[PDB]
Every structure is written in C-alpha cells, then in structure tokens.
Design an enzyme around this catalytic site. Structure first.
Site, PDB file in Angstrom:
ATOM      1  N   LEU B  19       0.832  -1.200   0.000  1.00 38.62           N
ATOM      2  CA  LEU B  19       0.000   0.000   0.000  1.00 38.62           C
ATOM      3  C   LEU B  19       0.868   1.252   0.000  1.00 38.62           C
ATOM      4  CD1 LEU B  19      -2.713  -1.093   2.608  1.00 38.62           C
ATOM      5  CD2 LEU B  19      -2.773  -1.328   0.121  1.00 38.62           C
ATOM      6  N   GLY B  20       9.069   3.856   6.625  1.00 38.23           N
ATOM      7  CA  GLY B  20       9.150   2.452   6.245  1.00 38.23           C
ATOM      8  C   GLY B  20       8.015   2.071   5.316  1.00 38.23           C
ATOM      9  N   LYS B  21       7.974   0.803   4.914  1.00 36.86           N
ATOM     10  CA  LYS B  21       6.935   0.307   4.004  1.00 36.86           C
ATOM     11  C   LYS B  21       5.613   0.024   4.739  1.00 36.86           C
ATOM     12  N   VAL B  22       4.541  -0.124   3.959  1.00 43.03           N
ATOM     13  CA  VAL B  22       3.205  -0.434   4.484  1.00 43.03           C
ATOM     14  C   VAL B  22       2.543  -1.511   3.614  1.00 43.03           C
ATOM     15  CG1 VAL B  22       0.948   0.478   5.177  1.00 43.03           C
ATOM     16  CG2 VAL B  22       2.957   1.948   5.285  1.00 43.03           C
ATOM     17  N   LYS B  37       2.268  -1.338   9.077  1.00 42.03           N
ATOM     18  CA  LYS B  37       3.421  -0.450   8.944  1.00 42.03           C
ATOM     19  C   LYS B  37       4.647  -1.058   9.628  1.00 42.03           C
ATOM     20  CE  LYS B  37       3.513   3.737  10.786  1.00 42.03           C
ATOM     21  NZ  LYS B  37       3.465   5.208  11.023  1.00 42.03           N
ATOM     22  N   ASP B 123      -3.876  17.524  11.691  1.00 41.62           N
ATOM     23  CA  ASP B 123      -3.693  17.385  10.251  1.00 41.62           C
ATOM     24  C   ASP B 123      -4.966  16.917   9.521  1.00 41.62           C
ATOM     25  OD1 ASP B 123      -2.222  17.533   7.829  1.00 41.62           O
ATOM     26  OD2 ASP B 123      -1.476  15.484   8.021  1.00 41.62           O
TER      27      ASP B 123
HETATM   28  C1  LIG Z   1      -4.050   2.263  -2.395  1.00 41.65           C
HETATM   29  O1  LIG Z   1      -5.421   1.927  -2.054  1.00 41.65           O
HETATM   30  C2  LIG Z   1      -5.702   1.785  -0.712  1.00 41.65           C
HETATM   31  C3  LIG Z   1      -6.930   1.230  -0.352  1.00 41.65           C
HETATM   32  C4  LIG Z   1      -7.265   1.056   0.982  1.00 41.65           C
HETATM   33  C5  LIG Z   1      -6.392   1.444   2.007  1.00 41.65           C
HETATM   34  N1  LIG Z   1      -6.822   1.235   3.273  1.00 41.65           N
HETATM   35  C6  LIG Z   1      -6.144   1.435   4.414  1.00 41.65           C
HETATM   36  N2  LIG Z   1      -6.749   1.065   5.565  1.00 41.65           N
HETATM   37  C7  LIG Z   1      -6.114   1.249   6.719  1.00 41.65           C
HETATM   38  N3  LIG Z   1      -4.899   1.798   6.788  1.00 41.65           N
HETATM   39  C8  LIG Z   1      -4.276   2.171   5.659  1.00 41.65           C
HETATM   40  C9  LIG Z   1      -2.997   2.757   5.691  1.00 41.65           C
HETATM   41  C10 LIG Z   1      -2.389   3.020   4.460  1.00 41.65           C
HETATM   42  C11 LIG Z   1      -1.124   3.606   4.434  1.00 41.65           C
HETATM   43  C12 LIG Z   1      -0.497   3.922   5.628  1.00 41.65           C
HETATM   44  N4  LIG Z   1      -1.083   3.676   6.793  1.00 41.65           N
HETATM   45  C13 LIG Z   1      -2.297   3.105   6.881  1.00 41.65           C
HETATM   46  N5  LIG Z   1      -2.797   2.890   8.106  1.00 41.65           N
HETATM   47  C14 LIG Z   1      -2.097   3.102   9.234  1.00 41.65           C
HETATM   48  C15 LIG Z   1      -2.428   4.185  10.061  1.00 41.65           C
HETATM   49  C16 LIG Z   1      -1.731   4.428  11.254  1.00 41.65           C
HETATM   50  N6  LIG Z   1      -1.962   5.432  12.122  1.00 41.65           N
HETATM   51  C17 LIG Z   1      -2.980   6.321  12.096  1.00 41.65           C
HETATM   52  O2  LIG Z   1      -3.872   6.347  11.248  1.00 41.65           O
HETATM   53  C18 LIG Z   1      -3.017   7.361  13.256  1.00 41.65           C
HETATM   54  C19 LIG Z   1      -1.861   7.746  13.931  1.00 41.65           C
HETATM   55  C20 LIG Z   1      -1.907   8.681  14.965  1.00 41.65           C
HETATM   56  C21 LIG Z   1      -3.119   9.254  15.343  1.00 41.65           C
HETATM   57  C22 LIG Z   1      -4.280   8.882  14.671  1.00 41.65           C
HETATM   58  C23 LIG Z   1      -5.619   9.515  15.060  1.00 41.65           C
HETATM   59  F1  LIG Z   1      -5.450  10.685  15.669  1.00 41.65           F
HETATM   60  F2  LIG Z   1      -6.316   9.775  13.971  1.00 41.65           F
HETATM   61  F3  LIG Z   1      -6.263   8.665  15.843  1.00 41.65           F
HETATM   62  C24 LIG Z   1      -4.227   7.947  13.635  1.00 41.65           C
HETATM   63  C25 LIG Z   1      -0.705   3.569  11.592  1.00 41.65           C
HETATM   64  C26 LIG Z   1      -0.376   2.492  10.804  1.00 41.65           C
HETATM   65  C27 LIG Z   1      -1.059   2.249   9.630  1.00 41.65           C
HETATM   66  C28 LIG Z   1      -0.621   1.041   8.824  1.00 41.65           C
HETATM   67  N7  LIG Z   1      -4.911   1.986   4.474  1.00 41.65           N
HETATM   68  C29 LIG Z   1      -5.157   2.018   1.652  1.00 41.65           C
HETATM   69  C30 LIG Z   1      -4.815   2.177   0.304  1.00 41.65           C
END
Ligand SMILES: COc1ccc(Nc2ncnc(-c3cccnc3Nc3cc(NC(=O)c4cccc(C(F)(F)F)c4)ccc3C)n2)cc1
Ligand SMILES: COc1ccc(Nc2ncnc(-c3cccnc3Nc3cc(NC(=O)c4cccc(C(F)(F)F)c4)ccc3C)n2)cc1
Ligand SMILES: [Ca+2]
Ligand SMILES: [Ca+2]
Ligand SMILES: [Ca+2]
Ligand SMILES: [Ca+2]
Ligand SMILES: [Ca+2]
EC number: 2.7.11.1
Lengths: 282, 274
Positions: B19, B20-22, B37, B123
């Site tokens: 989708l 460091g790497k994810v 992540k 943000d």
């Molecule tokens: C390319 O097409 C897609 C299609 C569906 C998705 N769906 C998806 N679903 C869930 N997560 C992600 C995601 C994509 C790229 C990077 N990170 C993602 N999620 C993610 C989010 C977080 N952290 C947060 O969202 C976060 C961090 C601190 C605070 C908060 C908040 F304040 F909002 F609670 C939220 C940590 C680790 C990960 C893997 N992506 C992504 C790409």
C-alpha cells in the site's frame, strides 16, 4: 566536543563558596589554582543531551556583554559549566540592596549594552527569550554580562498548510526569522521599566492573571513620566509595540537617541561601586 | 508496553500486498485484513499509545503492535474504501451534500472523542479520512503523524503569551474545527481553498484573508454555508467546539450513513473498470 572527559575539574579548580541552588544543581564560587581567576561553576548530577545545548550556545556567544564560558567538564557523573565570575551580581539584586531603581543615565548604559548584546545574539539566530534584570550580571568596570539561569530559555511542520487554522499559521510564523527575535525587544522594554521602577508592570497580579493582562492591555508605560526624558518614553513606546511585524530590531534601536550618543559606562561603574560599598555595611 | 517482543508477527500475519513500508496483511487464523506499517523507537511508541487510547467507531482501530527482529510492526484494521480524496479522484467529482453531511457528522463525533481525551489531530484533510464498505469513516493520520496530547510571565511579549495560550485547553482543540471546515470545502470542490498558490504563499493568504466560502453558493443549502461560516471563524476564542457543532442543523438530524455507503459502492464499481 566542547566538554572534556579527560580532565578532573578538581585538579584545576578550587570550590571557595556557594552562590545559587537552582533546581538544576548547585552553583559555586570557584578559584583557579594556577591563575587565581574566579569563576561561577554550575555542577549538574544521556540526560546530558539537554544540557550540552547550553554549552554550545555559550561557546558561540563570544562577546564583551555576554557571560564568558571558561570551560565545561563531564567527570564522575557530574557536568561542570564554568562561567567567568561577575563580582557585581545581578541588576535586580543591586536594586534590592540599594533600595532604589537605577537613574536614567545608568539605564541608558544598560540599554545600550543590552541592545549590542541582542544585536549579536540575533545575528547568530539566537533568541534569549527570558530577558529581565535578574539576567543582567555586572562587572566592577561597569559593564553588563547578559546571562540566563534556571531552565535556560536560550535557543536557535505542524500540519499541511492548506488546512491550517490562522492562529496556527501565526504561531508557526512567530517561530522563525524575523518575528522570533522581536520577543526579546519587548522583554527589553519591560526590563527597562523594571530597572526604572524596581518591579515590572502588573507585578501585583498573580502569574496566571498577568498573561491575560499582557495580551489584552495597551502596552505599559512609566508610572511617573515627569521623572524621565522624552527619549526614554519614546524608546519604550516604540519598543513596546504589541505588533511584532512593526516592532523594531536591536540594530534599529541602537540609532534611537535614547542610546545613540552613549559612549561611556561611567554611570554604571558608579552604580556598581555604590552597591559594593552598601554590601560592605555592618 | 503495548508492543509484544515475545511474538513473531509472521507466525500470525501473511503479507499479501503493498500500500518504512506499508503492507496489506491477512490474518492466518481469522482471515481479518490489516494494513501493516513496518519500521527499521521512542518517537514511534507515541503513535501506538495514541492509537491504543483511541478506541472509537470512527477512528482507525489498532489490532496490534510488535517489535521483532529489529523491526517495529503497527497493525491497523484495513479500510477497503480507501481515503476520501482518492475517492474523489477516481469518480472525478466532489461529494454530494448528503455525503458531506454524513462525513461531517461522523468527523464531529470522532473529534469530540479525541478532544475530550485531550488529543488534538492537527492534520485534518480528506486524505486522512478512510472509508469502510459499510459507509463509515475512520479518521487516520499518515506521514509524520501530527496527533498529540517559555520565559517568566511579567516580561513576555504579547505574541508569545498568545502562542503559549493556544497550546493548552480550550484553544488548542479549536485548530481541528477550522481544518474540519476546510476539509468540507475540499470534499465539496475537490481542492481546498487557495490550492492554486504554492505552499508558502498559502500561509500568508490564510493569515490575512477573510475565511474561505464555497465557490458556487447556490449549489448548497443555507445549513452548509452557515455551518462553514461558524466553523471557519478566524478567532479561536469564539470558534465553536465539536460538541457545539453537533447541534447545528447541518448535522443534528443526520441519522443514516446511506449516502456515504452509496458513495463507497460507486467508488468500488468504478475502480473495477478495465
Ligand atoms: C491504495 O489503495 C488503498 C486502499 C485502501 C487502504 N486502506 C487502508 N486502511 C487502513 N490503513 C491504511 C494505511 C495506508 C497507508 C499507511 N497507513 C495506513 N494505516 C495506518 C495508520 C496508522 N496510524 C494512524 O492512522 C493514526 C496515527 C496517529 C493518530 C491517529 C488519530 F489521531 F487519527 F487517531 C491515527 C498507523 C499504521 C497504519 C498502517 N490503508 C489504503 C490504500
Ligand atoms: C550572591 O551574589 C552574587 C554575586 C555575584 C554573582 N556572580 C555570578 N557571576 C557569574 N555567574 C553567576 C551565576 C550565578 C548563579 C547561576 N549561574 C551563574 N552563571 C552561570 C550561567 C550560565 N549560563 C548562562 O548564563 C547562559 C545560558 C544560556 C544562554 C545564555 C545567553 F543567551 F545569555 F548567552 C547564557 C551557566 C553557568 C553558570 C555558572 N554569578 C552571583 C551572585
Ligand atoms: Ca573588559
Ligand atoms: Ca517582585
Ligand atoms: Ca551607606
Ligand atoms: Ca491537489
Ligand atoms: Ca462506470
């Protein structure tokens, strides 16, 4: 580094008195075994990371009107920071010992030399951020040395910009050049009132209420304007501009008539001689 | 900690996409899908503690965190709908007003939760709103995650007093209310206001201009325009809170996510085209 681990400071320095006990650690009067030179030594028990910042600032701040770093050692779990000793003490203490404010001519020397020191700090991208009379040390020659004690406040992207609230844009813009330095120009103005009146403006209010007061009130002015020259009052008016965009810089204020003709530190040398004679009383 | 060192994540998770790497990851036991992540720690534990506290229907849901073989794993529940900004690009249009009301309602509920826990997002934008196939949002943050919980006062300059007062309650949370307002315009118009200006000039513009309004006000209800007027208050003192805005008629009657479920079904069908 700017910190020696090879050398034990007790080999070179003799602790001959105590000065302050700032929550950081103890502070001693120290005498050099080789030279006789006197120093103020701050001794602090990798939490050192926070503390090395202070030494790098001091090491860069080589100027006649800023405290002068003689050395820094880390030895036997203790960090030593050795500044040249300023026998006159701080200006606020001098006013307490004499039980009066400074004369206008003593405040002009102070103001002149502070402006020069600030012009130097700012041109090195250093902001003091805690100016006050307690942070101006005096030598017996009648020169200041700008210092900072306590939680030393000296120092050199919160979101994507299209979505940022105006107040966040403003408080990020206040953190880099040329806005950040302006805070010191304000605090300088207040330090001049403190030296004129002993107490800063709003000294009667508790610390939390005074913040509200600063934000919402017109800028402070001298209590008895007839005691003071128009040059002093105009200098304050201009320096205590609530708008940091129009607040002048240190280099600009050095051309103001309040300080532009000051070429002698006589008045301030006299102050320090008098304070010393007063201290001597018993 | 909230991080397990005893367990190797490869024993439980299978990496099945990128989708460091994810990575897109699939649970070997359950089948549950996750976004993982993986990072090469002090800075990074902060994120996990925030996520661990943020247990709410409309905020990304932390499934686990592991530290194993020099790598930190952070596992979030997979949101198959993607981010709202990507949805608008795929459909080549903005959201309808009824879709923006659902988004607005649920974002307000999420923000009310974060702020009542003394968490500020800082943000907000459509790229931080993930969608589930049920039509619910999940508020996220990517990149340099911006989520998080000076001198002696008599001598302090007024601008320093103001910028210290903006950093604690109740002023700090107000920044999110503004960004929410701009996110609503972004969803209505695809681009935020001042999108034509480079990033440095836009800061000047935000500080000195009247608050932004919708480009074609006749396309939108008076409720939407009033909501914006109120939320995009340049004065954080008078800017309302999330709890207050939940009583505004733009969102106070929204009781269904239907409109947003329809958006995600359409985006999925569009993605399928080849
Ligand atoms: C390319 O097409 C897609 C299609 C569906 C998705 N769906 C998806 N679903 C869930 N997560 C992600 C995601 C994509 C790229 C990077 N990170 C993602 N999620 C993610 C989010 C977080 N952290 C947060 O969202 C976060 C961090 C601190 C605070 C908060 C908040 F304040 F909002 F609670 C939220 C940590 C680790 C990960 C893997 N992506 C992504 C790409
Ligand atoms: C009780 O009567 C007296 C009489 C004379 C003195 N004289 C004196 N002379 C020199 N220093 C001190 C001093 C007293 C208490 C605490 N610290 C003192 N100096 C000191 C200052 C510092 N650091 C700074 O002043 C500093 C730190 C960061 C930035 C800056 C600046 F921005 F100003 F450059 C300055 C570090 C270490 C020391 C020992 N005190 C003190 C008390
Ligand atoms: Ca000299
Ligand atoms: Ca006092
Ligand atoms: Ca006497
Ligand atoms: Ca764009
Ligand atoms: Ca189609």
């Amino acid at each position: 580094e700017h910190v020696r681990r090879d050398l034990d400071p007790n080999e070179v320095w003799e602790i001959v008195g105590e000065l302050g006990d700032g929550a950081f650690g103890k502070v001693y009067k120290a005498k050099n075994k080789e030279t006789g030179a006197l120093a103020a030594a701050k001794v602090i028990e990798e939490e050192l990371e926070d503390y090395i910042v202070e030494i790098e600032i001091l090491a860069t701040c080589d100027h006649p009107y800023i405290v002068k770093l003689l050395g820094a050692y880390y030895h036997d779990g203790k960090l030593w920071i050795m500044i040249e000793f300023c026998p006159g003490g701080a200006v606020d203490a001098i006013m307490l010992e004499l039980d009066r404010g400074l004369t206008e001519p003593q405040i002009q020397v102070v103001c002149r030399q502070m402006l020069e020191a600030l012009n130097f700090l700012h041109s090195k991208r250093i902001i003091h951020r805690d100016l006050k009379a307690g942070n101006v040390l005096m030598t017996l020659e009648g020169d200041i040395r700008l210092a900072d004690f306590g939680v030393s406040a000296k120092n050199l992207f919160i979101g994507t910009p299209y979505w940022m609230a105006p107040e966040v844009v403003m408080c990020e813009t206040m953190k880099d050049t040329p806005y950040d330095y302006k805070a010191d120009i304000w605090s300088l103005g207040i330090t001049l009132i403190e030296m004129a009146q002993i107490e800063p403006p709003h000294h009667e209010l508790n610390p939390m209420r005074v913040l509200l007061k600063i934000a919402k009130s017109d800028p402070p002015t001298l209590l008895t304007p007839s005691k003071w020259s128009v040059e002093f009052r105009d200098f304050l008016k201009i320096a205590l501009d609530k708008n940091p965009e129009t607040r002048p810089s240190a280099a600009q204020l050095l051309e103001h008539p309040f300080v532009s003709s000051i070429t002698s530190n006589k008045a301030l040398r006299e102050l320090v001689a008098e304070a010393k004679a007063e201290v001597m009383e018993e």
